[PDB]
Amino acid sequence: APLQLGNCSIAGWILGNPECESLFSKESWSYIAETPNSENGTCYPGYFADYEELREQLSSVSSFERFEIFPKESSWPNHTVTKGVTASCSHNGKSSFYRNLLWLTEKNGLYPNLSKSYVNNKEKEVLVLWGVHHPSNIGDQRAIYHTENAYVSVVSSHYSRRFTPEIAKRPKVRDQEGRINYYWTLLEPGDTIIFEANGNLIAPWYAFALSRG
Amino acid sequence: QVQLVQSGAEVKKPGASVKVSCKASGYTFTGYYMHWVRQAPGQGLEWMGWINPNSGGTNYAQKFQGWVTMTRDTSISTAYMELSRLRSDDTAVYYCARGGLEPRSVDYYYYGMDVWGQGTTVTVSSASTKGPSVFPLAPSSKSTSGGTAALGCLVKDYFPEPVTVSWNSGALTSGVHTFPAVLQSSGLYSLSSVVTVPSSSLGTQTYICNVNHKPSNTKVDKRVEPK
């Protein structure tokens, strides 16, 4: 059983592109090869890490379940969850964002140190995706996150990396000079993944508990 | 009732410093940025920078960085603005404004100004209290047009404001216009008062302008006679 992604790539579908989610809803498939990676495949420009490896892991998935790993209206009381929208990810003429990611911003002039962990209790491999914002100028960095020494740390038993977003003025792609780089890992049943940051974190919203056999 | 109330007007010698205050009420002081804007007489608005009251962090405009310091006192909801080494070009009105407008997207994450303060006038001049020098603007056939001559009084080099000018001790009110004062490069003010009377009235009617400058306790009555 295939997946039939249509005009959408794997990166767009798994991230929750507003133009993609309108046609996909399966559980037990076997084929996924529909559209290769495009520089316009994600609604916000950026690099998708280990893309070809993710294509192999999602091959012949026997069980698929999308679940809210971090509730939007309950996980980030000291941050704004409503302003993370952008014209590059427009839906029906209004600025939107990824259906599975959450762009956190400052609240009341502060971006407090956030620390959010999640214990895998689904008895399946949980695919967790997130992003890191690389702004186009220091003004945007100060406006959205206040701090200029921003770090994002993501630690689990299989994954451990400290990201330091760099301010880079890049060629205009999809009306964006900045970028969000996308990362992912496979959380083991019973393992804990910890997200810590003081800015630039595109936090996970929905994750995927899957099985390939 | 969101309201910003600033401190009163100040006069300062060139090279001195002045600290302007901006009291906030009607909202949480720390939840919104406080901007500062300068407007010279007859000029446009000039952004000076903003301060984050929550963290104390600042963002100065390039033109004002160095001789300009912004602070805030959260306990009394009051964001301060200190000017250093004042010069004559710093004579202007200084407003504070609150960044209460909420941004809708990260594409333009900026809190727009909504509520302004009433403004603080800062006047920078090296001049001390001085009485004016009054000179006549005599009528002539040069200033005669269609049978209506124009006389006047030149009120020059006084400080501070204001002066009052009357003609014939208040009896002559028709055709009188007293121009607004202008600030000169020396730091002193000057204005003039003109009256249009018929060219048949001179020679028989005496015209005297009465200049009163209260800050110097000076009163001048100058005769304006034809030449």
Next chain:
Amino acid sequence: QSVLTQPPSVSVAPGQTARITCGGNNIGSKSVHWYQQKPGQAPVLVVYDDSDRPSGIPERFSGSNSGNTATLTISRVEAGDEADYYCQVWDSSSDHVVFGGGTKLTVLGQPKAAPSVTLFPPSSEELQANKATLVCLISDFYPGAVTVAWKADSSPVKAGVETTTPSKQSNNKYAASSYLSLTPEQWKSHRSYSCQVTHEGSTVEKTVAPTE
């Protein structure tokens, strides 16, 4: 800092529609705010987020923002709408708040009138005090916008010039003044002095000379 370009002045008859533009680089992708400032008063927000109005502002004020131009529209203009109008956008590339140059909206509720000019030479008393001031008095003009240029023997003079902003007279017409400070030696050395007043693109000039 990225620049915002506003027309210096806009004139409109009462009841008609006034349009004030704010040009900027990619301003269509930013939320423009407009402010109204009447003489002697603090600015007041009249339009925010391109086209929204705060409570208390009549529906006559509207706005639009597309491409490189943002427009503030005032329908059925009244006399009370005479003010200076400023646009404001944040420039992320500099982290600077930018104000437009400002637009002076004049509502023409009064017929046009050319200015009358009287030029007074330095008085004899002032000359004996080793001082000299030329006084240029402009009166009875409308609208209240005037440009003054000083001349000395067909030569431009920009040193020692002080001009007042036009103020209303008793007859609801405008008046302004200009002062040319000079020394008595400068006064007598030259053939003549001239005060040139520009109003609505036309000129009225008066000349005085020390030997008359």
